Tab-separated table of N, CA and C in Angstrom:
chain	number	residue	atom	x	y	z
A	877	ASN	N	0.821	-1.219	0.000
A	877	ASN	CA	0.000	0.000	0.000
A	877	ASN	C	0.855	1.269	0.000
A	878	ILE	N	2.036	1.193	0.608
A	878	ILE	CA	3.013	2.277	0.497
A	878	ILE	C	3.745	2.139	-0.836
A	879	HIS	N	3.873	0.901	-1.309
A	879	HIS	CA	4.416	0.645	-2.630
A	879	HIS	C	3.433	1.214	-3.650
A	880	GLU	N	2.155	1.286	-3.261
A	880	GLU	CA	1.127	1.984	-4.041
A	880	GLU	C	1.388	3.478	-4.128
A	881	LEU	N	2.039	4.055	-3.121
A	881	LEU	CA	2.473	5.450	-3.231
A	881	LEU	C	3.836	5.460	-3.914
A	882	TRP	N	3.861	4.876	-5.101
A	882	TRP	CA	5.077	4.686	-5.875
A	882	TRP	C	4.608	4.000	-7.157
A	883	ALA	N	3.724	3.009	-6.988
A	883	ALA	CA	2.969	2.390	-8.094
A	883	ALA	C	1.714	3.209	-8.475
A	884	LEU	N	1.398	4.223	-7.665
A	884	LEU	CA	0.293	5.144	-7.961
A	884	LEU	C	0.623	6.525	-7.410
A	885	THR	N	1.872	6.929	-7.635
A	885	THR	CA	2.345	8.240	-7.218
A	885	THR	C	3.563	8.655	-8.064
A	886	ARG	N	4.625	7.848	-8.012
A	886	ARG	CA	5.793	8.062	-8.873
A	886	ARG	C	5.428	7.875	-10.349
A	887	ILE	N	4.473	6.986	-10.625
A	887	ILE	CA	3.990	6.791	-12.002
A	887	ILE	C	3.253	8.057	-12.493
A	888	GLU	N	2.656	8.793	-11.547
A	888	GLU	CA	1.897	10.027	-11.859
A	888	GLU	C	2.788	11.126	-12.420
A	889	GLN	N	4.087	11.004	-12.180
A	889	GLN	CA	5.063	11.987	-12.648
A	889	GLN	C	5.514	11.744	-14.104
A	890	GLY	N	4.594	11.264	-14.943
A	890	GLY	CA	4.890	11.026	-16.369
A	890	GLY	C	5.516	9.664	-16.630
A	891	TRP	N	5.759	8.927	-15.552
A	891	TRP	CA	6.399	7.616	-15.622
A	891	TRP	C	5.451	6.512	-16.124
A	892	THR	N	6.034	5.471	-16.722
A	892	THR	CA	5.287	4.316	-17.241
A	892	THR	C	5.902	3.000	-16.721
A	893	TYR	N	5.103	1.943	-16.671
A	893	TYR	CA	5.601	0.622	-16.317
A	893	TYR	C	6.401	-0.015	-17.465
A	894	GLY	N	7.378	-0.843	-17.106
A	894	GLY	CA	8.213	-1.533	-18.095
A	894	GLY	C	9.681	-1.544	-17.684
A	895	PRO	N	10.453	-2.525	-18.199
A	895	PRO	CA	11.862	-2.772	-17.831
A	895	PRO	C	12.894	-1.913	-18.582
A	896	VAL	N	13.100	-0.683	-18.110
A	896	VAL	CA	14.170	0.199	-18.625
A	896	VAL	C	14.505	1.269	-17.583
A	897	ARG	N	15.588	1.045	-16.843
A	897	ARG	CA	15.881	1.837	-15.643
A	897	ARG	C	16.674	3.120	-15.940
A	898	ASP	N	15.995	4.116	-16.510
A	898	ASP	CA	16.595	5.429	-16.778
A	898	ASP	C	15.492	6.483	-16.957
A	899	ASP	N	15.800	7.732	-16.604
A	899	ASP	CA	14.806	8.817	-16.679
A	899	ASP	C	14.412	9.125	-18.134
A	900	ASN	N	15.328	8.896	-19.077
A	900	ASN	CA	15.028	9.084	-20.505
A	900	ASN	C	13.984	8.079	-21.011
A	901	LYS	N	13.970	6.898	-20.398
A	901	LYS	CA	12.982	5.870	-20.728
A	901	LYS	C	11.577	6.262	-20.248
A	902	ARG	N	11.512	7.162	-19.261
A	902	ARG	CA	10.255	7.532	-18.583
A	902	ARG	C	9.541	6.271	-18.104
A	903	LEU	N	10.320	5.335	-17.560
A	903	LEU	CA	9.818	4.000	-17.246
A	903	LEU	C	10.648	3.331	-16.136
A	904	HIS	N	10.016	2.453	-15.363
A	904	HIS	CA	10.713	1.737	-14.306
A	904	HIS	C	10.114	0.331	-14.083
A	905	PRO	N	10.965	-0.720	-14.152
A	905	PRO	CA	10.554	-2.145	-14.118
A	905	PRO	C	9.798	-2.579	-12.858
A	906	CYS	N	10.139	-2.007	-11.706
A	906	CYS	CA	9.563	-2.446	-10.436
A	906	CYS	C	8.168	-1.859	-10.170
A	907	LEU	N	7.701	-0.969	-11.049
A	907	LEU	CA	6.405	-0.296	-10.868
A	907	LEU	C	5.235	-1.292	-11.006
A	908	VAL	N	5.189	-2.255	-10.092
A	908	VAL	CA	4.251	-3.366	-10.165
A	908	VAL	C	4.124	-4.017	-8.801
A	909	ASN	N	3.477	-5.178	-8.761
A	909	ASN	CA	3.322	-5.913	-7.512
A	909	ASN	C	4.679	-6.328	-6.936
A	910	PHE	N	4.803	-6.252	-5.608
A	910	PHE	CA	6.041	-6.639	-4.905
A	910	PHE	C	6.263	-8.152	-5.004
A	911	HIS	N	5.186	-8.899	-5.257
A	911	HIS	CA	5.279	-10.349	-5.423
A	911	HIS	C	6.068	-10.719	-6.683
A	912	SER	N	6.068	-9.835	-7.684
A	912	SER	CA	6.763	-10.100	-8.952
A	912	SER	C	8.261	-9.811	-8.829
A	913	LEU	N	8.620	-8.526	-8.762
A	913	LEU	CA	10.025	-8.132	-8.611
A	913	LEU	C	10.493	-8.509	-7.203
A	914	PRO	N	11.796	-8.804	-7.051
A	914	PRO	CA	12.371	-9.295	-5.795
A	914	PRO	C	12.254	-8.268	-4.664
A	915	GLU	N	12.085	-8.738	-3.427
A	915	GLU	CA	11.907	-7.843	-2.282
A	915	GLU	C	13.265	-7.631	-1.608
A	916	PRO	N	14.146	-6.886	-2.306
A	916	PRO	CA	15.451	-6.217	-2.235
A	916	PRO	C	15.447	-4.975	-3.130
A	917	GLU	N	15.233	-5.165	-4.432
A	917	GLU	CA	14.969	-4.042	-5.336
A	917	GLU	C	13.634	-3.371	-4.997
A	918	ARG	N	12.667	-4.167	-4.547
A	918	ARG	CA	11.392	-3.623	-4.066
A	918	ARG	C	11.546	-3.154	-2.610
A	919	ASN	N	12.666	-3.516	-1.984
A	919	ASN	CA	12.991	-3.042	-0.637
A	919	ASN	C	13.472	-1.603	-0.695
A	920	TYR	N	13.761	-1.132	-1.909
A	920	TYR	CA	13.995	0.290	-2.132
A	920	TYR	C	12.705	1.031	-1.787
A	921	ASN	N	11.583	0.330	-1.921
A	921	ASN	CA	10.290	0.840	-1.487
A	921	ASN	C	9.922	0.367	-0.071
A	922	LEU	N	9.576	-0.913	0.059
A	922	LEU	CA	9.010	-1.456	1.307
A	922	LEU	C	9.946	-1.454	2.534
A	923	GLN	N	11.249	-1.646	2.325
A	923	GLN	CA	12.173	-1.831	3.462
A	923	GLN	C	12.410	-0.554	4.252
A	924	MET	N	12.595	0.570	3.561
A	924	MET	CA	12.817	1.846	4.256
A	924	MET	C	11.543	2.237	5.011
A	925	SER	N	10.383	1.881	4.454
A	925	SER	CA	9.112	2.071	5.156
A	925	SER	C	9.055	1.152	6.376
A	926	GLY	N	9.651	-0.036	6.263
A	926	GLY	CA	9.675	-0.996	7.372
A	926	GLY	C	10.559	-0.536	8.517
A	927	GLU	N	11.687	0.085	8.174
A	927	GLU	CA	12.544	0.738	9.161
A	927	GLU	C	11.836	1.952	9.746
A	928	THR	N	11.009	2.603	8.932
A	928	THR	CA	10.210	3.728	9.399
A	928	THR	C	9.179	3.248	10.412
A	929	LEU	N	8.757	1.997	10.262
A	929	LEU	CA	7.799	1.396	11.173
A	929	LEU	C	8.449	0.847	12.438
A	930	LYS	N	9.639	0.270	12.306
A	930	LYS	CA	10.403	-0.145	13.483
A	930	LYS	C	10.733	1.087	14.312
A	931	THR	N	10.995	2.186	13.613
A	931	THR	CA	11.313	3.446	14.256
A	931	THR	C	10.062	4.083	14.854
A	932	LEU	N	8.921	3.919	14.189
A	932	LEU	CA	7.661	4.420	14.739
A	932	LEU	C	7.340	3.660	16.023
A	933	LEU	N	7.720	2.384	16.062
A	933	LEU	CA	7.675	1.615	17.306
A	933	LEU	C	8.706	2.149	18.313
A	934	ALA	N	9.840	2.629	17.804
A	934	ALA	CA	10.917	3.159	18.649
A	934	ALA	C	10.542	4.488	19.310
A	935	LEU	N	9.616	5.221	18.697
A	935	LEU	CA	9.237	6.551	19.180
A	935	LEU	C	8.361	6.494	20.436
A	936	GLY	N	7.816	5.315	20.733
A	936	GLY	CA	6.902	5.146	21.861
A	936	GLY	C	5.498	5.589	21.507
A	937	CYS	N	5.272	5.836	20.214
A	937	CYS	CA	3.976	6.305	19.732
A	937	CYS	C	2.901	5.221	19.890
A	938	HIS	N	1.649	5.655	20.024
A	938	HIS	CA	0.528	4.740	20.255
A	938	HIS	C	0.137	4.012	18.971
A	939	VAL	N	0.988	3.075	18.556
A	939	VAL	CA	0.838	2.368	17.286
A	939	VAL	C	-0.140	1.193	17.395
A	940	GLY	N	-0.700	0.994	18.589
A	940	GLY	CA	-1.588	-0.133	18.872
A	940	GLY	C	-2.801	-0.229	17.960
A	941	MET	N	-3.109	-1.450	17.529
A	941	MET	CA	-4.117	-1.693	16.488
A	941	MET	C	-5.532	-1.292	16.906
A	942	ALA	N	-6.310	-0.791	15.950
A	942	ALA	CA	-7.747	-0.552	16.152
A	942	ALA	C	-8.535	-0.908	14.885
A	943	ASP	N	-9.675	-1.581	15.059
A	943	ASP	CA	-10.524	-2.045	13.942
A	943	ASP	C	-9.741	-2.879	12.909
A	944	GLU	N	-10.287	-3.026	11.691
A	944	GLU	CA	-9.559	-3.685	10.586
A	944	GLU	C	-8.368	-2.816	10.181
A	945	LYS	N	-7.300	-3.448	9.704
A	945	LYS	CA	-6.061	-2.721	9.416
A	945	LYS	C	-5.330	-3.277	8.198
A	946	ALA	N	-4.669	-2.385	7.460
A	946	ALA	CA	-3.928	-2.756	6.258
A	946	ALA	C	-2.951	-1.653	5.864
A	959	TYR	N	-10.165	7.656	-11.308
A	959	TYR	CA	-8.773	7.234	-11.446
A	959	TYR	C	-8.302	7.349	-12.901
A	960	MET	N	-7.270	8.164	-13.143
A	960	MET	CA	-6.727	8.333	-14.498
A	960	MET	C	-6.134	7.006	-14.973
A	961	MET	N	-6.285	6.727	-16.266
A	961	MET	CA	-5.904	5.434	-16.826
A	961	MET	C	-4.385	5.323	-17.058
A	962	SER	N	-3.630	5.121	-15.974
A	962	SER	CA	-2.168	4.938	-16.058
A	962	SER	C	-1.816	3.634	-16.792
A	963	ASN	N	-0.749	3.659	-17.595
A	963	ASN	CA	-0.239	2.436	-18.249
A	963	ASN	C	0.366	1.487	-17.213
A	964	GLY	N	0.299	0.189	-17.485
A	964	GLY	CA	0.795	-0.815	-16.546
A	964	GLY	C	-0.120	-1.025	-15.357
A	965	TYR	N	0.433	-1.554	-14.265
A	965	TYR	CA	-0.342	-1.915	-13.071
A	965	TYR	C	-1.062	-0.692	-12.497
A	966	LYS	N	-2.327	-0.879	-12.116
A	966	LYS	CA	-3.207	0.246	-11.739
A	966	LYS	C	-3.930	-0.008	-10.415
A	967	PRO	N	-3.209	0.163	-9.286
A	967	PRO	CA	-3.843	-0.072	-7.980
A	967	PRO	C	-4.997	0.919	-7.719
A	968	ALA	N	-6.064	0.468	-7.060
A	968	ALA	CA	-7.239	1.316	-6.788
A	968	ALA	C	-7.658	1.204	-5.316
A	969	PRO	N	-6.910	1.875	-4.406
A	969	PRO	CA	-7.095	1.689	-2.961
A	969	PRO	C	-8.502	2.035	-2.472
A	970	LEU	N	-9.008	1.261	-1.509
A	970	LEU	CA	-10.355	1.477	-0.965
A	970	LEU	C	-10.368	2.611	0.070
A	971	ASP	N	-10.782	2.331	1.313
A	971	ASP	CA	-11.002	3.392	2.305
A	971	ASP	C	-9.705	3.805	3.012
A	972	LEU	N	-8.745	4.324	2.257
A	972	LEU	CA	-7.520	4.863	2.847
A	972	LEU	C	-7.266	6.300	2.394
A	973	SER	N	-7.723	6.647	1.188
A	973	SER	CA	-7.378	7.946	0.592
A	973	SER	C	-7.974	9.133	1.376
A	974	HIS	N	-9.128	8.916	1.998
A	974	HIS	CA	-9.825	9.984	2.727
A	974	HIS	C	-9.333	10.154	4.160
A	975	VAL	N	-8.456	9.261	4.617
A	975	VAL	CA	-8.117	9.180	6.039
A	975	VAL	C	-7.468	10.470	6.579
A	976	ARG	N	-7.935	10.911	7.751
A	976	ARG	CA	-7.426	12.107	8.431
A	976	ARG	C	-6.364	11.759	9.493
A	977	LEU	N	-5.615	12.766	9.951
A	977	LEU	CA	-4.513	12.557	10.902
A	977	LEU	C	-4.270	13.779	11.817
A	978	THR	N	-3.897	13.529	13.074
A	978	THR	CA	-3.515	14.610	14.005
A	978	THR	C	-2.106	15.121	13.660
A	979	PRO	N	-1.862	16.423	13.883
A	979	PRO	CA	-0.618	17.099	13.472
A	979	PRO	C	0.688	16.529	14.049
A	980	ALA	N	0.636	16.020	15.282
A	980	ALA	CA	1.825	15.465	15.954
A	980	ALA	C	2.410	14.266	15.192
A	981	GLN	N	1.528	13.494	14.573
A	981	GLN	CA	1.933	12.297	13.864
A	981	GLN	C	2.783	12.688	12.652
A	982	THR	N	2.465	13.840	12.055
A	982	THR	CA	3.260	14.379	10.952
A	982	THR	C	4.653	14.760	11.429
A	983	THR	N	4.733	15.224	12.681
A	983	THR	CA	6.020	15.561	13.291
A	983	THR	C	6.841	14.290	13.541
A	984	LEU	N	6.169	13.218	13.972
A	984	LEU	CA	6.850	11.950	14.235
A	984	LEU	C	7.395	11.412	12.921
A	985	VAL	N	6.552	11.471	11.891
A	985	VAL	CA	6.931	10.984	10.573
A	985	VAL	C	8.064	11.818	9.987
A	986	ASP	N	8.049	13.109	10.293
A	986	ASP	CA	9.114	13.986	9.850
A	986	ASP	C	10.427	13.616	10.560
A	987	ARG	N	10.326	13.190	11.818
A	987	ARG	CA	11.505	12.709	12.531
A	987	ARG	C	12.019	11.433	11.887
A	988	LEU	N	11.092	10.616	11.418
A	988	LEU	CA	11.467	9.378	10.772
A	988	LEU	C	12.207	9.707	9.475
A	989	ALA	N	11.736	10.761	8.810
A	989	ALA	CA	12.348	11.250	7.584
A	989	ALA	C	13.746	11.774	7.862
A	990	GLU	N	13.916	12.353	9.046
A	990	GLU	CA	15.217	12.846	9.456
A	990	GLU	C	16.180	11.686	9.638
A	991	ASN	N	15.735	10.684	10.384
A	991	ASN	CA	16.579	9.552	10.720
A	991	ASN	C	16.972	8.769	9.471
A	992	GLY	N	16.021	8.598	8.561
A	992	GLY	CA	16.313	7.870	7.342
A	992	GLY	C	17.183	8.671	6.386
A	993	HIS	N	16.928	9.977	6.313
A	993	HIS	CA	17.712	10.840	5.439
A	993	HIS	C	19.159	10.955	5.926
A	994	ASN	N	19.346	10.856	7.235
A	994	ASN	CA	20.675	10.959	7.819
A	994	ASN	C	21.444	9.634	7.780
A	995	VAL	N	20.731	8.536	7.997
A	995	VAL	CA	21.342	7.229	7.821
A	995	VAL	C	21.718	7.082	6.338
A	996	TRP	N	20.920	7.703	5.469
A	996	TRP	CA	21.273	7.847	4.060
A	996	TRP	C	22.481	8.752	3.887
A	997	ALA	N	22.605	9.723	4.789
A	997	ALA	CA	23.682	10.697	4.706
A	997	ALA	C	25.030	10.125	5.163
A	998	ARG	N	24.997	8.988	5.854
A	998	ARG	CA	26.233	8.341	6.244
A	998	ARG	C	27.067	7.897	5.038
A	999	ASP	N	26.393	7.525	3.956
A	999	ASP	CA	27.092	7.042	2.767
A	999	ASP	C	27.330	8.152	1.732
A	1000	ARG	N	26.340	9.022	1.525
A	1000	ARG	CA	26.448	10.052	0.470
A	1000	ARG	C	27.556	11.051	0.788
A	1001	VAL	N	27.742	11.324	2.074
A	1001	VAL	CA	28.774	12.260	2.498
A	1001	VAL	C	30.143	11.650	2.221
A	1002	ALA	N	30.226	10.316	2.270
A	1002	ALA	CA	31.464	9.617	1.929
A	1002	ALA	C	31.757	9.773	0.428
A	1003	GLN	N	30.717	10.050	-0.362
A	1003	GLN	CA	30.846	10.178	-1.814
A	1003	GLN	C	30.547	11.587	-2.313
A	1016	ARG	N	30.340	14.213	-4.028
A	1016	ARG	CA	31.179	15.279	-3.516
A	1016	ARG	C	30.534	16.078	-2.351
A	1017	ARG	N	30.400	17.394	-2.514
A	1017	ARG	CA	29.618	18.203	-1.562
A	1017	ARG	C	28.145	18.120	-1.958
A	1018	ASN	N	27.466	17.115	-1.394
A	1018	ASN	CA	26.070	16.843	-1.784
A	1018	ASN	C	25.199	17.959	-1.202
A	1019	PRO	N	24.134	18.348	-1.921
A	1019	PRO	CA	23.263	19.420	-1.440
A	1019	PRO	C	22.646	19.104	-0.077
A	1020	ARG	N	22.391	17.821	0.180
A	1020	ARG	CA	21.881	17.408	1.486
A	1020	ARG	C	22.929	16.786	2.432
A	1021	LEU	N	24.048	17.490	2.628
A	1021	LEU	CA	25.022	17.183	3.702
A	1021	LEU	C	24.300	17.261	5.054
A	1022	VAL	N	23.359	18.198	5.141
A	1022	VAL	CA	22.726	18.587	6.383
A	1022	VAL	C	21.612	17.679	6.896
A	1023	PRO	N	21.467	17.609	8.235
A	1023	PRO	CA	20.365	16.996	8.961
A	1023	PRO	C	19.057	17.745	8.716
A	1024	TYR	N	17.968	17.004	8.822
A	1024	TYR	CA	16.641	17.488	8.478
A	1024	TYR	C	16.198	18.698	9.278
A	1025	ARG	N	16.705	18.835	10.492
A	1025	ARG	CA	16.322	19.971	11.321
A	1025	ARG	C	16.799	21.289	10.724
A	1026	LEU	N	17.910	21.257	9.983
A	1026	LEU	CA	18.477	22.481	9.408
A	1026	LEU	C	18.420	22.573	7.879
A	1027	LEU	N	17.920	21.538	7.212
A	1027	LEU	CA	17.830	21.584	5.763
A	1027	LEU	C	16.703	22.501	5.299
A	1028	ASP	N	16.836	23.019	4.077
A	1028	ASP	CA	15.895	24.012	3.533
A	1028	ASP	C	14.449	23.471	3.488
A	1029	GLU	N	13.496	24.358	3.775
A	1029	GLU	CA	12.093	23.981	3.971
A	1029	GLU	C	11.465	23.300	2.761
A	1030	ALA	N	11.930	23.645	1.565
A	1030	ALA	CA	11.424	23.010	0.345
A	1030	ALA	C	11.786	21.531	0.320
A	1031	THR	N	12.921	21.187	0.921
A	1031	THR	CA	13.359	19.794	0.986
A	1031	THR	C	12.656	19.027	2.109
A	1032	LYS	N	11.944	19.736	2.988
A	1032	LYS	CA	11.114	19.068	3.993
A	1032	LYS	C	10.054	18.231	3.309
A	1033	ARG	N	9.412	18.814	2.299
A	1033	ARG	CA	8.268	18.198	1.635
A	1033	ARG	C	8.593	16.884	0.936
A	1034	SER	N	9.809	16.757	0.417
A	1034	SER	CA	10.161	15.604	-0.415
A	1034	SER	C	10.083	14.293	0.365
A	1035	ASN	N	10.441	14.348	1.641
A	1035	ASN	CA	10.339	13.189	2.515
A	1035	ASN	C	9.037	13.231	3.324
A	1036	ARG	N	8.602	14.447	3.641
A	1036	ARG	CA	7.425	14.642	4.473
A	1036	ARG	C	6.162	14.146	3.780
A	1037	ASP	N	6.130	14.191	2.452
A	1037	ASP	CA	4.952	13.728	1.710
A	1037	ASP	C	4.819	12.214	1.783
A	1038	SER	N	5.929	11.518	1.534
A	1038	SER	CA	5.961	10.059	1.591
A	1038	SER	C	5.691	9.612	3.022
A	1039	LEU	N	6.134	10.426	3.981
A	1039	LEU	CA	5.891	10.148	5.393
A	1039	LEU	C	4.402	10.294	5.722
A	1040	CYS	N	3.794	11.364	5.212
A	1040	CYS	CA	2.371	11.626	5.441
A	1040	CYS	C	1.471	10.586	4.771
A	1041	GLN	N	1.894	10.041	3.634
A	1041	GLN	CA	1.120	8.959	3.030
A	1041	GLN	C	1.192	7.710	3.896
A	1042	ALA	N	2.343	7.490	4.520
A	1042	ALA	CA	2.481	6.391	5.474
A	1042	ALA	C	1.554	6.652	6.655
A	1043	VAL	N	1.420	7.923	7.031
A	1043	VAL	CA	0.482	8.309	8.086
A	1043	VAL	C	-0.954	8.020	7.652
A	1044	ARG	N	-1.204	8.132	6.348
A	1044	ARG	CA	-2.531	7.896	5.797
A	1044	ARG	C	-2.877	6.406	5.816
A	1045	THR	N	-1.953	5.563	5.368
A	1045	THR	CA	-2.170	4.112	5.414
A	1045	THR	C	-2.231	3.579	6.851
A	1046	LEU	N	-1.445	4.167	7.751
A	1046	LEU	CA	-1.391	3.694	9.139
A	1046	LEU	C	-2.600	4.145	9.950
A	1047	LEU	N	-2.983	5.409	9.788
A	1047	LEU	CA	-4.196	5.900	10.440
A	1047	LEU	C	-5.412	5.243	9.776
A	1048	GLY	N	-5.230	4.795	8.532
A	1048	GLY	CA	-6.251	4.030	7.818
A	1048	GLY	C	-6.262	2.586	8.286
A	1049	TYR	N	-5.205	2.191	8.993
A	1049	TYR	CA	-5.223	0.946	9.751
A	1049	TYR	C	-5.901	1.196	11.095
A	1050	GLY	N	-6.203	2.469	11.363
A	1050	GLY	CA	-6.781	2.885	12.631
A	1050	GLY	C	-5.729	3.186	13.677
A	1051	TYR	N	-4.457	3.034	13.305
A	1051	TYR	CA	-3.367	3.310	14.233
A	1051	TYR	C	-3.320	4.792	14.633
A	1052	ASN	N	-3.001	5.033	15.899
A	1052	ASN	CA	-2.605	6.358	16.373
A	1052	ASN	C	-1.082	6.514	16.285
A	1053	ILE	N	-0.586	7.747	16.392
A	1053	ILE	CA	0.866	7.971	16.394
A	1053	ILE	C	1.283	9.152	17.273
A	1054	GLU	N	1.041	9.030	18.574
A	1054	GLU	CA	1.453	10.062	19.538
A	1054	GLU	C	2.165	9.416	20.743
A	1055	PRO	N	3.064	10.168	21.416
A	1055	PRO	CA	3.876	9.684	22.551
A	1055	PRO	C	3.051	9.203	23.746
A	1071	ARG	N	23.546	30.171	27.958
A	1071	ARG	CA	23.899	31.564	28.144
A	1071	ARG	C	22.658	32.496	28.199
A	1072	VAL	N	22.668	33.531	29.052
A	1072	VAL	CA	21.548	34.504	29.144
A	1072	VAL	C	22.019	35.959	29.352
A	1073	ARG	N	21.832	36.808	28.337
A	1073	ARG	CA	22.209	38.228	28.426
A	1073	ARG	C	21.222	39.051	29.224
A	1074	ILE	N	21.711	40.164	29.762
A	1074	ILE	CA	20.895	41.142	30.487
A	1074	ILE	C	21.341	42.561	30.141
A	1075	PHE	N	20.401	43.501	30.066
A	1075	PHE	CA	20.699	44.868	29.602
A	1075	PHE	C	20.086	45.925	30.504
A	1076	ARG	N	20.913	46.787	31.094
A	1076	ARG	CA	20.431	47.732	32.101
A	1076	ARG	C	21.162	49.036	32.108
A	1077	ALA	N	20.517	49.996	32.758
A	1077	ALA	CA	20.959	51.380	32.779
A	1077	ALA	C	22.148	51.628	33.661
A	1078	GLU	N	22.814	52.734	33.400
A	1078	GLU	CA	23.871	53.207	34.252
A	1078	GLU	C	23.294	53.607	35.610
A	1079	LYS	N	24.047	53.339	36.669
A	1079	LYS	CA	23.592	53.609	38.019
A	1079	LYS	C	23.399	55.054	38.291
A	1080	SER	N	24.131	55.899	37.593
A	1080	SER	CA	24.044	57.308	37.823
A	1080	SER	C	22.659	57.848	37.513
A	1081	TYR	N	21.973	57.210	36.576
A	1081	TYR	CA	20.693	57.712	36.130
A	1081	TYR	C	19.567	57.230	37.007
A	1082	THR	N	19.893	56.416	38.017
A	1082	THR	CA	18.872	55.752	38.809
A	1082	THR	C	18.019	56.738	39.516
A	1083	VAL	N	16.736	56.431	39.655
A	1083	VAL	CA	15.823	57.378	40.263
A	1083	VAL	C	15.331	56.965	41.628
A	1084	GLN	N	15.508	57.840	42.624
A	1084	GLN	CA	15.137	57.513	43.973
A	1084	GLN	C	13.893	58.255	44.430
A	1085	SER	N	13.270	59.003	43.525
A	1085	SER	CA	12.065	59.739	43.866
A	1085	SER	C	11.146	60.008	42.685
A	1086	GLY	N	9.851	60.084	42.976
A	1086	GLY	CA	8.861	60.565	42.025
A	1086	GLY	C	8.270	59.550	41.065
A	1087	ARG	N	7.235	59.995	40.375
A	1087	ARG	CA	6.638	59.266	39.290
A	1087	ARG	C	7.636	59.186	38.130
A	1088	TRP	N	7.676	58.037	37.463
A	1088	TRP	CA	8.607	57.800	36.367
A	1088	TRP	C	8.116	56.741	35.386
A	1089	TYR	N	8.722	56.703	34.212
A	1089	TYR	CA	8.279	55.837	33.144
A	1089	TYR	C	9.333	55.649	32.054
A	1090	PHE	N	9.464	54.420	31.560
A	1090	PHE	CA	10.430	54.083	30.532
A	1090	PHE	C	9.802	53.113	29.578
A	1091	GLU	N	10.403	52.864	28.420
A	1091	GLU	CA	9.713	52.118	27.372
A	1091	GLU	C	10.545	51.170	26.574
A	1092	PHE	N	9.870	50.185	26.002
A	1092	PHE	CA	10.547	49.113	25.311
A	1092	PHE	C	9.786	48.652	24.098
A	1093	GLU	N	10.441	48.653	22.941
A	1093	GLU	CA	9.836	48.047	21.771
A	1093	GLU	C	10.421	46.655	21.587
A	1094	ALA	N	9.585	45.684	21.212
A	1094	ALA	CA	10.086	44.327	20.967
A	1094	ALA	C	10.312	44.094	19.486
A	1095	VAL	N	11.542	43.742	19.120
A	1095	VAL	CA	11.840	43.439	17.723
A	1095	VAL	C	11.137	42.152	17.298
């Protein structure tokens, strides 16, 4: 179902099903059932989500089960998900998923930094806001499938003062401060 956000999401970006692994082909062989292509190359999809789930378990979030749990004519395989697309979510869960995106992007960063000055040298907390969305979207879809499983996902100092000479020991007085 998360592979569906790849078999019915990455395909939406002009991509087509079929065996030719290059952007010029506008096509990708694994854009199909995980039962067909091996679950290593398909682990490029399912496995990182699985680590995202082990990590969602690691967060102490209320992942405990509730209830039952689990269109333009695109070429190739055409998944048609039932009652998951409408699913709503509390804001904190997006933060947890964003943390998961941080952890995965950084564990990814252990190798890329070894290879030049990659644009994403940085941890997710300090990376540019436009790059938040790239992982945050895939994270939020995971939030959609999981909440559609009925799952929940929740758990120096400066000082500035006047000269003593100006101090006032008598009378009505008043001073002012603007906050930047």
